[PDB]
Structure formats: C-alpha cells, structure tokens
C-alpha cells in the first residue's frame, strides 16, 4: 500500500559517509544484499514494509536517497572502497567539482546552483505519498552545514505538509575545524526556522561510546563511528518497516517531542551496544542506560532535565515490563519542573530486533541540557566574532557580519527558551 515513504538526502563528506552505515543497516535488516540489490533469500524474507526506505524495481532494490556534495572525492572514494557502485548509483549523485572550503556561506550559495537538478530528481522519483525527508549532514564543515541548511529551507518551502527531519553532527569538544562555530550557529539558526526535528550527535560522545561501551581497540575509519548514527536512524523507524504492537511515524514522534515550537533539538541514545548484553539485560536496565549521559550521543555534563522523550522498544520485549517500569523512570530520571508525573513518555514497540540482538531500546530526548551544549557553541562563536576573525570569506559569499550577528542572537534566544523551561 502506497504511503509512508521517506527520501534521505546525504550532504557533504560526513553526511555521505554516514550514509554508507545507514543503508548497510537498512539492507541487512530487510535481508537485502547491498552489493547485488537482491533479497538474500525468499525463505528468510520477513513480513515487512521495504518501501519506507527502499525502491523495488524489477532488477532489485535501490535506496530512496540522493548523494550530494560540492566536491567529488568523499563520495567516489567511499563508493569504490565499500563497493557500492550498483546501490549508490550515478543517477542518485549530485556532485560538483570544488568544495565549500569549510565556509557555510559558500556551501549555501554554491548549492543554489544545484537546487534545480535536485528538485527535478525528487519530483521525478518520489511517490505522491512521500511522507517527508531526512537530511544527513555535519554542521562543522561548509557543504553539509550550508548546503544542508539550504536544502532544509528549500524542501520545507517546496513541500509543505511533508516532514523535514535533520540528523546533524555537531563538532567535537575541541573543534577540529576552527570555522565550526560560525558554521554551526548559521546551521542551527536555519534549522530552527525550517526543520521539524533536529536529531543531534557529536564525535566526542561517539568516540567515547565506541571506546567505552564497545571497547573497540582502534577506530581506523569513520565507519567504526557512524554505525551508531545508522543504528539510531534505523531503530526509530523500525515500527514503520516491521510488525509490532505499537507503531509510530516521523511526525508522530516530533509531535510528542516538541513542547514549544522552538524546542526541536533532540539528543539520541541507544542500549545495549553489543549482542552479548542484549541477551543479559532487562527492559529496565536498558532504559536506565539510555537515560545515562554515558550513552547520550551528544557530549553532556549530566542528565539535564528531560522535557519529553520517545522510547522505541525493539525485539523480544516484555510489554508488562515496558509499562511497569514507567513509574521507575519518572521517579529516577530528572524531568523538567513543569512535566506532570504521568507524562513525558512516548512508546513505540516493534517485534523486529536489530541484527543479532535479542532486544534494544532507543531514546530520543528533548532535554534542557542542550542549552549547555549550545552555550558552549555560542561562547566559541563569540570568541571569534568579537575579534572579527575568519569573517572575510563569509562576507565575500553573501553572509554579512550583520547576518552573522542576527543568526547568533536568534540562536541565543533558543538557548534561553530551553534554560527557562529548565527552571
């Protein structure tokens, strides 16, 4: 039955490198071989809804995706190294020849030139019942940040009534791009206006999880980091793709999360991280891990105060435990002062476990501690802007110093909304 289809837009180096892990997970969950485009078997094919992310053509399955960058190397090198040539196919690529040089404004203005072709591919490919778009991107560079922002604006304006969700990577605690505060503030200002829900990650938190929860001995490629983002993307959409007692769609989760129109910035977490612990944990233990800052995929100093939350239970779930632990969650986790004791929780329950695991819980948290995360971004921004450092090539590409300032001040207003709710 037509409907509920999603189109995924990958933007810049990080956004497309993350794409590899996402589509690899999606294919595996649906018993599809990403190298052949085919089901691995009829016998292991499951009752599912492949069409949420996958297009079934006579020849096989393809991603409902666009692979977008202003320079070609990250995508081409990725496609060759991972042998994705028949899945990340050429008609799905929108690649130019010179990057944005880590400047948001260059990503935004150069990206305008490619909007016609992107809109044409969208209207050429998508079904009428498309429910919305996911935009995958980093905020610290210039293409994912500026072109990603432009895409968020363009899609929301071109397709009112469809969802626009962003999966957005914040810079690490010490930034690895000195321009990142400018790019991050400009991006979050744009997404605050045009996105319906912004799910955030940062690399400090992701490395900590991989090193301390998975105990990987070394991280040699971003694939050994991005898999965590793929996992969050796949699990929160699982009840759209597999049977379950209690399903939920994109705007349903946003509606439950967004208490005030500006509070749309979400911290995700998942538990457990391994197959062995999924066999040896309870629903209570997994939820408590999700609410613990060790499992937050944004680097936070503490639990903060939860305004609202979405919990996806996947796999071999005792429904009576899922409900019975609700009072323990409301008692043991700090919620914002205005949250009623009986509120702040939204449940999805899906019978399909992630690959190899017995069960898994994913948490999306609308948490006041994002004000601390954003304040630290703002402090970095101010240390540059107050000295007029690095502003020249924003100005040359159409972002005036006044524009930088208004983006900063609107960013500050969102921070203050979260801090006021915190109490």
Ligand X SMILES: Nc1nc2c(ncn2[C@@H]2O[C@H](COP(=O)(O)OP(=O)(O)OP(=O)(O)O)[C@@H](O)[C@H]2O)c(=O)[nH]1
Q: Which residues bind ligand X (CB under 6 A)?
A: 12-14, 17-18, 70, 99-102, 138, 140-144, 169, 171, 176-177, 203, 206, 222, 225-226
Residue 117 forms beta bridges with which residues? none
List the end-to-end C-alpha distance of the chain, in Å, as a whole number. 46
Residue pointed to by tokens 């690490």: 172
- Can you tell me the distance from the alpha carbon of 364 to that of 199, in angstroms, rounded to the nearest whole number? 8
Task: Give Cα separations from 306 to 85, 201, 259, 288, 364 (angstroms).
Answer: 43, 17, 11, 13, 10
- Select from ligand X, Mg ion, none the partner in contact with residue 258, using the beta carbon and a kind-dependent cut-off of 5 to 8 Å: none
- Select from Mg ion, ligand X, none the partner in contact with residue 102, using the beta carbon and a kind-dependent cut-off of 5 to 8 Å: ligand X
Report which residue's Cβ sits closest to Mg ion. 13
Tokens standing for 102? 């880590």
Q: Is 143 or 399 the residue whose CB approaches ligand X more closely? A: 143
Task: Give Cα separations from 404 to 23, 58, 151, 154, 390 (angstroms).
Answer: 36, 50, 19, 20, 12
Closest distance to ligand X from the beta carbon of 73 (Å): 9
Q: Is 141 or 272 the residue whose CB approaches Mg ion more closely? A: 141
Alpha carbon 282 to chain centroid, angstroms: 27
What are the start-end ranges of the H helices in 280-355? 283-290, 319-324, 326-332
Closest distance to ligand X from the beta carbon of 29 (Å): 21
Closest distance to ligand X from the beta carbon of 69 (Å): 6
Closest distance to Mg ion from the beta carbon of 146 (Å): 11
- Select from ligand X, Mg ion, none the partner in contact with residue 176, using the beta carbon and a kind-dependent cut-off of 5 to 8 Å: ligand X
Q: Is 131 or 203 the residue whose CB approaches ligand X more closely? A: 203
Residue 56 forms beta bridges with which residues? 61
Q: Is 70 or 377 the residue whose CB approaches ligand X more closely? A: 70
Closest distance to ligand X from the beta carbon of 327 (Å): 36
Tokens standing for 84? 């994705």
Closest distance to Mg ion from the beta carbon of 108 (Å): 14
Closest distance to ligand X from the beta carbon of 172 (Å): 6
Closest distance to ligand X from the beta carbon of 356 (Å): 23
Applying CB under 5 A, the span of 7-15, 20-28, 174-182, 358-366 interacting with Mg ion comes to 7-15
Q: Is 99 or 181 the residue whose CB approaches Mg ion more closely? A: 99
Applying CB under 5 A, the span of 5-13, 42-50, 256-264, 376-384 interacting with Mg ion comes to 5-13
Q: Is 178 or 247 the residue whose CB approaches ligand X more closely? A: 178
Q: Is 100 or 325 the residue whose CB approaches ligand X more closely? A: 100
Query: Alpha-carbon Rg of the chain, whole angstroms?
Result: 20
Q: Is 111 or 354 the residue whose CB approaches ligand X more closely? A: 111
- Enumerate residues 6+ apart whose C-beta is below 8 A from 114: 68, 94, 96, 147
Question: Using an 8 Å Cβ cutoff, are 115 and 152 in contact?
Answer: no
Closest distance to ligand X from the beta carbon of 145 (Å): 6
- Can you tell me the distance from the alpha carbon of 168 to that of 203, in angstroms, rounded to the nearest whole number? 11
What are the start-end ranges of the H helices in 159-221? 180-194, 203-212
Q: Return the DSSP state at 172.
A: P
Q: Which of 7, 8, 10, 13 binds Mg ion (CB under 5 A)?
A: 13
Q: Is 100 or 339 the residue whose CB approaches ligand X more closely? A: 100
Number of residues that bind Mg ion (CB under 5 A): 2
- Select from ligand X, Mg ion, none the partner in contact with residue 49, using the beta carbon and a kind-dependent cut-off of 5 to 8 Å: none
Contact letters (x/-) for Mg ion, 72-101, by CB under 5 A?
A: ---------------------------x--
Q: Could you say whether residue 16 binds Mg ion (CB under 5 A)? A: no
Q: Is 99 or 268 the residue whose CB approaches Mg ion more closely? A: 99
- Enumerate residues 6+ apart whose C-beta is below 8 A from 200: 168, 169, 170, 265, 266, 267, 268, 297, 298, 370, 373
Q: What is the 3-state secondary structure (H, E, C) of 103-168?
A: CHHHHHHHHHHHHHHHHHHHHHHCCCCCCEEEEEEECCCCHHHHHHHHHHHHHHHHCCCCEEEEEE
Contact residues: Mg ion, CB under 5 A: 13, 99
């Amino acid at each position: 039955m037509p409907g509920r289809e999603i189109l995924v837009l990958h933007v810049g180096q990080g956004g497309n490198q993350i794409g590899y892990n996402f589509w690899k997970t999606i294919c595996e969950e649906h018993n599809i071989d990403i190298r052949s485009n085919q089901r691995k078997s009829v016998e292991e094919d499951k009752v599912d809804y492949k069409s949420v992310f996958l297009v079934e053509a006579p020849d096989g399955f393809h991603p409902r995706a666009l692979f977008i960058d202003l320079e070609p190397l990250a995508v081409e090198f990725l496609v060759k190294e991972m042998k994705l040539g028949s899945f990340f196919s050429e008609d799905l690529m929108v690649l130019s020849y010179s990057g944005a040089h880590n400047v948001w404004s260059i990503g935004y203005q150069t990206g305008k030139k490619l909007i016609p072709v992107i809109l044409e591919k969208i209207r050429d490919t998508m079904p009428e019942t498309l429910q919305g778009f996911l935009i995958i991107h980093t905020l610290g560079g210039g293409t994912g940040s500026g072109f990603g922002s432009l895409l968020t604006e363009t899609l929301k304006k071109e397709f009112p009534g469809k969802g626009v969700l962003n999966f957005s990577v914040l810079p690490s605690e010490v930034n690895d791009v000195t321009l990142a505060p400018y790019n991050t503030v400009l991006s979050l200002n744009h997404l605050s206006r045009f996105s319906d829900l912004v799910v955030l990650f940062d690399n400090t938190a992701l490395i900590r999880i991989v090193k301390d929860q998975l105990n990987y001995p070394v991280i040699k490629q971003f694939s050994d980091l991005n898999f965590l983002i793929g996992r969050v993307m796949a699990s929160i959409t699982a009840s759209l793709r597999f049977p379950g007692p209690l399903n939920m769609d994109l705007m349903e989760m946003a509606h439950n999360l967004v208490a005030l129109p500006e509070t749309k910035f979400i911290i995700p977490s998942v538990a457990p991280l391994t197959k062995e612990e999924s066999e040896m944990s309870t629903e209570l233990d997994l939820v408590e891990r999700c609410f613990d800052p060790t499992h937050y995929m944004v680097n936070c100093s503490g639990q903060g105060k939860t305004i609202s939350s979405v919990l996806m239970f996947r796999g071999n779930i005792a429904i009576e435990n899922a409900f019975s632990i609700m009072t323990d969650i409301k008692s043991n986790v700090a919620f914002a002062p205005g949250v009623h004791p009986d509120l702040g929780l939204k449940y999805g329950i899906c019978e399909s476990a992630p690959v190899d695991f017995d069960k898994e819980v994913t948490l999306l948290s609308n948490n006041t501690i994002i004000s601390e995360v954003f304040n630290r971004v703002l402090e970095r921004f101010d240390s540059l802007f107050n000295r007029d450092w690095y502003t020249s090539d924003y100005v040359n590409a159409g972002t005036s110093k006044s524009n930088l300032k208004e983006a900063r001040d609107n960013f500050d207003r969102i921070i203050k909304i979260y801090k006021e709710i915190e109490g």
